[PDB]
Amino acid sequence: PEPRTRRRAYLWCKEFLPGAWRGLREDEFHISVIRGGLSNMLFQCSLPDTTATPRKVLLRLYGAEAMVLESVMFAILAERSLGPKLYGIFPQGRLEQFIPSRRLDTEELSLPDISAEIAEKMATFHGMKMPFNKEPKWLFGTMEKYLKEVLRIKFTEESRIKKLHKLLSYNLPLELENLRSLLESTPSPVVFCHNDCQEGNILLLEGRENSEKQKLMLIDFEYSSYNYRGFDIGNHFCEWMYDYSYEKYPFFRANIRKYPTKKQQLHFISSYLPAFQNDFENLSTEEKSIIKEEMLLEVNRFALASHFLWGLWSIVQAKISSIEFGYMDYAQARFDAYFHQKRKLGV
Ligand SMILES: Cc1csc(NC(=O)[C@H]2CC[C@@H](n3cnc4c(N)nc(Cl)nc43)CC2)n1
Ligand SMILES: [Mg+2]
């Protein structure tokens, strides 16, 4: 961090944080990076070990309408103990509780205890009443948004042109309508969705590793909105196939075989349903199975919208992102998986 901003950070923490931060000099202010990106940047600010009395906070610099919303949403989830505590909010960013933890790894998503908890937390999130638009316009609204951007994009480099040409050759505008007809035919309750429920957005809390049902916290609610519940679950299933930790180009690995098996999907929803609908436990065996089977159809259909949306999203990112990542390859992997899924489903 360039030392000019190492100043601002100091002030933000001097002004906004209580106790020993109030009477802190600039010569005792440690702040390391946590993640660059020139957008939604994260830093760890802390005291010297020498200063008696929180000792560590996270600072989030925004970088690049939706600012009002994100802020209220974060504040609400903090108030309700569903998110990190909010300690300071300003134009450039916010100071948040630092949660001692690590992000999950992809392989961990399939661990029965982890899956069960993720299902529980998503269910809780889905139960939240939030002060936002309750109409489910997000999913197609966003896909149309990205689609229009996609059709406008021109790349100078030659292989990017060929990659894009291959993607445009699927006839994306017609394929979107194909998905619309399928998804408008597939009922799914509208709820407050995380919309980006990937391993990277799930913290395993330090010293709770032994807890069976209470070791996780969903974070990063950048894409959260009222949306079809099938999207949140289908999208999460899809994330079983993608590992963003790979250290070589394109900086992800995709594995269609790691998509949850029927059994793994039933285990997830088995834990989702009681958590979401409290009386669910008390239905007949017959009735539970009906709901489960319907739910498998629903989530596996919406899974198609996860490939499609993130596919489009990734083409745009290839134009405009500063992040070192193989977007065009990722987009192609999402479309591969999209068609593979349509084939598996007979749609
Ligand atoms: C150099 C360095 C020191 S620590 C670090 N990375 C990490 O600790 C991981 C795991 C914890 C995670 N984290 C903890 N609190 C939060 C929070 N409030 N919001 C978000 Cl979005 N993430 C949070 C950050 C990413 N890098
Ligand atoms: Mg993943």
From Swiss-Prot:
Chief place where the protein resides: cytoplasm
Effect seen on changing residue 169 to D: Mimics phosphorylation; promoting localization to lipid droplets
Binding of phosphocholine, residues: 37-39
Modified residues (Phosphoserine): 169
UniProt EC number: 2.7.1.32, 2.7.1.82
Biological role: Plays a key role in phospholipid biosynthesis by catalyzing the phosphorylation of free choline to phosphocholine, the first step in phosphatidylcholine biosynthesis. Also phosphorylates ethanolamine, thereby contributing to phosphatidylethanolamine biosynthesis. Has higher activity with choline. May contribute to tumor cell growth.
Disease named in the record: Neurodevelopmental disorder with microcephaly, movement abnormalities, and seizures: An autosomal recessive neurodevelopmental disorder characterized by severe global developmental delay, impaired intellectual development, microcephaly, early-onset seizures, and movement abnormalities.
Protein name (database record): Choline kinase alpha
Boundaries of the shown chain within the full protein: 83 to 457 of 457
